[PDB]
């Protein structure tokens, strides 16, 4: 599994992205308040290189607050980035689940065929008899494979499909709201910004706070790149949420239409100069409950003439039904 | 050993990421305790770069206690973890010392067909005699492994892996138990925390504690990180044993029933066009003690198309008995 | 794709070469005011090395003034860069999705024939037979990609790779009027500089500023690396943006005409020794939708031999349509 | 040697494993006491930071007492670790000399099988004639090395294995009894601790302990690492020793018994579909001095089924005696 | 193109050791006066380790005279020192371009031939058809080249070249004069240098200068690493800049002649015994316009015997235009 | 040499391990001494941080006493070790130089047996005609090695192999007593040490001594790891001597027997079914005098059987005496 199950969809490897560069913002915040010096205090009497190594740690762990001329979220923001990145990274591992118990094999089948092409694709004298090659090896093992998981819970992929991907758009917007709920909706912040107003007069986002002791005026040096990230971080989480939507009702409208959902194979089945017997009809009532979907991600990923190929070759041994 | 039978069970993995993650963080501690400071102390009189480097270690051995505006529990929960990730690992080793007691060897057999199929999977002469091929090298391997195990105390080997199934449910069921008791059961602790109750007011995880020696205020660094992973392990342990108890509940279920145990079988059984001579009946009776449960393993594992081929060339040759 | 569809237009390669050039310089200034030390200070009276240590991140987020014998855009300059070499990322992801959906697939079949001719450009037995060999294996491998893509939105990918063109000159433009847009439009600064006013009296780009805090002239070395950088990144940005305009409207002026359009291929249809049946009007009545960008494209990046044979090969089978 | 005489018995790698964990605590208590610091004092008057560092030393090899509100074993346990790690080395090292005065070789005839196994595993053509592959090479290998080892000091190699197993029986709780007598019986300690009686009271175990120096107040850093060591160690050992009196008793009752002793080769001899000449009293009646020990030492270490193989094929071509 | 097109004319190598010889001499001034320290200074009177790490940055920041018993240029060498190199890389990117719009392709042809004789230079069968081989394979690749140059933009290649070559001597000889403006012509410091007035009295390039700050006495350690490199770097340039016009002068006269620049074919056409039926006015007729340059071109490059073999070897051929 | 010449024989292997232990303790504790600090000493008045880094050095090369509430051997303990080390090696070069000046080549002799036996043991076509594989090439070699050492000083080599026994055995017992010559004869220090009295009152072994200074109580750390390396070392190197002499007496009985020394050859020309005309006796006049030896030297390092092969072997062409 690990090395070949473990490991090309079309903006699905936006959750891949997502969770690498959640891990690395959170991961590197780690390191810089737990390697560097995140914070920095001026009691303005006298120090001795000990006091302000023990005033650091008690302004960081207690209240900080803020006054223009104890609010802060240090002590959540690096830890719900890696739960965000965890979260980002379940949809991957629940589509597998549901692939397994669905009863087919669809990575295998993928593998399969792609090594099949990639080794006789350059054999010259296996390059005339192409058809018969392809409707030779694979297919037999895409058929043999269509006919065990039709007799065990395999009749609906594509609904299994589809809820995976209305999960993985929930969690997008589930994540973009949880980031909104960890304090100014973006553009308001943007503006403010923008105008130029930084933080003097705004408020929020400080740099020089002070603190309690029993006049500290504490600087705030890794607060500098919080704000420097969210506004990045908002943009393209909600540009991610947008594609996962657009994805979604995309598969949701294939789903519910089943009618120019087989405009593919039946674009593919008018290329081949044989047209011999079998209608494109009873191909369609011995393949169309799941193989369509496999014809479909063979094509998605893949390619369009080794699927072609696959699928004008399929039409020649189905058989086993009609 | 160490090359093939020290190294793919459907959720059974999470053992080896339990140890992992336990592992990591036990070994993440002590070096943080070990190499970093773990605490630090202030004696509102003076320094000189020489007292704070003793009363750190004698604050840190010696007991603290806390008031709001000697509890700890630094010295046992870093290896108490490394006693629960030797505990997770436990089980593994119990499966495999008591398949080896049964007198059949599993792994070596998954792994000699699985050689076969990754070997002749390609070739394109050895794919159309592909049933001669499966009932020619490795099906008589299983049959010999069959007939030399039937002799030796494997007659219930299923009931072996029930076990096995059952003492890894009870195992992680414990491992949380004891996680409970080294404090507030969870909830709790998230609704003091999400209604904005840190631990000024709430009291339990202090950060900034006093120190009897003969007003110190040592700050403990290292606490911040305790209460940031007790919050994921508690979920992630609940999570692991409820669904290795789904697991055992599945076995059991398996073992206890024996009637549509056999759905696979009766399922693969129907797909080639031989139907020669041998009922579906004296196949199970030749095979129905120990026989199942390694097609089974070797459908769970090899996939389906080589469990099925195997499994219906085994019937081609099934004489031995009848 | 991570092998062979993420990895040599005639000066695109400049969009790589921007994102290079600006991540370096971006992550080089991070890591100098981040490692090093960016600024200096000294109150004239006395310090305790600790003093200096927190008055220098003070009077780097507070802001400076200057005056000769609180400007500054040390906030925005290191981060801006990254978002410039992000968006200089964008156009070319945006032309692989605009391949992507135009239904047809270049990179694979451009990667197909320069396998095919580095394989057999060697081969001396097959090098009479030269013709032959390309009218044999590659040239039907192109058709086949033609003709499923001539039946799924793909009769304008000259259309759509226009439009990538005129994406990336206008992002170039925008860039290069973003960084005017922090601060003197270029020649006017090299003027102020090479008649001999470098800061002292110009005033704009100080070195020496002085800080409030209730004359602590603080020295800001890591500006002495801006203005030897803005000063080659301008020139270099309209270099670019130049470069990437007459790119444009070459590829304008070629969509547009249509005429001198085929000049390449009617120059390489005039060299074998053949001209047995085909007319030239009948064959780009057969391929000009599409399959003239596609042989476009593979001299101009294959060649021009290896070009002109596949396209002279491709004559003498061409009979989907006429 | 070194390559392949010096490099797998159930539970017997318990001495290689007992060795490593061992070593490794040895190694690293030596290099924490030697690197790090592991002891710390405080003279509550005034340091020069010269002077501890001479206190430590002077404490540190000068004996400490306790007292709660001259003691030590740091100068035995990491060395009389590794004097053990070197004791549990032993006894492989006695039975590798044990059987070179036997006058037999095993390691070498193992060795041999098993590289004609893994060979001649996957060969098709020689599968068939799998019994004549191995009365044909290796089997003639076996009798040889029987025929030279019969008549050389070798009737009684089960007799010297037995003897290896009852030193590393007693090797093993001299080990644990050698833990014992360096300071409270285990469960003692573990009862004064879970009942919440950690040091404070309980005495032994100190971690602030005074210092003779003509109130020096002396804390033991690396004491902490000893009784979180120990707690397991005797555990562990515990373990390691019942586990090999198990093994002694089984191969004591082995010897004594030499009835059900031929179980497995009475079992195997009835498998194969020949049965043609030579009886079962007479085959052992050639082998039974000390080929039965080999044969289950093949069985023991290769499998099963290519031990059975052997072992049958060894009779079709006993014929040296009888 | 990185891997082959990126990747030997006599002394044009002398742009690429130009190119790495200053940015070495660049980098390495940067990082001396990033990481060392490039200046020191004293003030007489007393200082707390944090003066001088503050007067440092800002003397050197600062101008600073010198008198003997406002001045420097540290601000611009390292600096137009890559600025130099890059305008040294500049005149090979020229070329390939020129080359690119030319219409052949030259490289790759070279390339080709060179890939042809290194592979069938040893073979023994294929050495006494040698003649035979050459106008087989290879001959007929550059022919085609050549046909297809012809018609497109290619008829003028070496007025290209040349050209070329005038921007490199206008290159070198600018960079020089630019060396100059940046102060003294050479040989005056050397006679200032050699007579014994190394800088006490002669007063330019001091190392022990003043500083304003409201008798601070700085030394210029970095200094003595710049006339230690321009006394040399004078040399260098002039030299190269001497040998490109050299070259310059010698191209002129090849383009300008036509007559004495057929030596070389001329000469080469006299040792093989065939002289069968081309004349030599021909030949040329039908190669003269661009062959001429790359026959020469494959001589300077692969050498003068796998050049003649091939330049024989394409006159029994040369039948597509006369 | 240095590839095959420079690198079995049971237990002088003892010589090499004797070598690595004793310089890796000799490099240790130059690196120790040399690195880390060894000895640390205390004036009870003050100190500078300078004081005591030269009262180190002057106590240490000085001499030091100690009372209880000038002796030290720290100068030649960590070199008289290296000269051991290195007088362990010797007698291997001896031994090397002894089978060179007998003129024979042993070690040339038995890798190409090994070789031989290496390549062809595996070979099944080969293996049938077994003993005529080794009567074809390894046997004449060893005869004519044989051959050509009767006649140049090699008539004895046994007599120059139990030399260099004697002396190894001597060479041991000499490195024991000079051991004992470096201050307590073993048990006596044990029995001092095991009823416990470490150093406070048995006076020997201090490590808090005093140091004259013109009361300055210097503490010798690195002493605390010499006498945990005596104990174990006597230990070792008597065990060593013992083994050794055990040898020696082994040896010296057979060369004194000559009767019993050809038991092995006469057990081995007891195995093959031929017998066919050369009696026992005049192999042993052809063979008796140095191939004897060389037999021995077979068996004892290439195993037995391939030995037996060899020396069966040998009897079939053995007629170039008798």
Same mark, same amino acid.
Request: aromatic share 18%; net charge positive.
């Given at each position: ?51 302000? #190594?023990?005033?650091?740690? +008690? ?7 803020? /006054?223009?001329?104890? =609010? &802060?979220? @240090? ?80 009749? #609906?992929?594509?609904?299994? +499909? ?7 758009? /929930?969690?997008?917007? =589930? &994540?973009? @709201? ?145």
């Amino acid at each position: 599994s690990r090395v070949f199950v473990q490991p090309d969809l079309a903006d699905r490897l936006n959750s891949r992205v997502t969770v690498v560069i959640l891990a690395v913002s959170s991961a590197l915040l780690l390191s810089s308040h737990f390697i560097g010096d995140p914070i920095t205090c001026w009691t303005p009497a006298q120090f001795n290189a000990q006091w302000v #190594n023990f005033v650091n740690q +008690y302004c960081f762990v207690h209240g900080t607050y803020f /006054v223009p001329l104890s =609010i &802060q979220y @240090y002590q959540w923001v690096p830890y719900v980035f890696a739960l965000q990145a965890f979260l980002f990274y379940i949809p991957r591992f629940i589509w597998k689940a549901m692939i397994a118990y669905s009863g087919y094999d669809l990575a295998a089948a993928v593998k399969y065929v792609d090594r099949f092409w990639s080794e006789n694709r350059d054999k010259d004298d296996k390059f005339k008899t192409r058809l018969a090659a392809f409707e030779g090896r694979p297919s037999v093992y895409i058929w043999d494979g269509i006919r065990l998981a039709r007799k065990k819970r395999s009749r #609906n992929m594509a609904l299994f +499909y589809t809820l995976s991907t209305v999960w993985q758009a /929930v969690n997008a917007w =589930i &994540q973009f @709201y949880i980031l909104t709920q960890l304090l100014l909706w973006g553009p308001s912040i943007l503006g403010d910004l923008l105008q130029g107003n930084d933080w003097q007069t705004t408020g929020h986002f400080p740099r020089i706070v002070h603190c309690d002791f029993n006049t500290v005026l504490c600087v705030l040096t890794l607060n500098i790149y919080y704000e420097k990230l969210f506004i990045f971080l908002w943009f393209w989480l909600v540009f991610v949420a947008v594609v996962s939507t657009v994805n979604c009702f995309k598969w949701i409208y294939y789903l519910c239409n089943k009618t120019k959902a087989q405009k593919t194979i039946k674009n593919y089945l008018s290329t081949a100069p044989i047209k011999s017997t079998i209608s494109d009809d009873q191909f369609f009532s011995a393949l169309g409950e799941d193989g369509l979907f496999i014809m479909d991600q063979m094509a998605l990923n893949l390619g369009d003439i080794p699927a072609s190929y696959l699928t004008i070759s399929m039409r020649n041994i189905c058989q086993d039904f009609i």
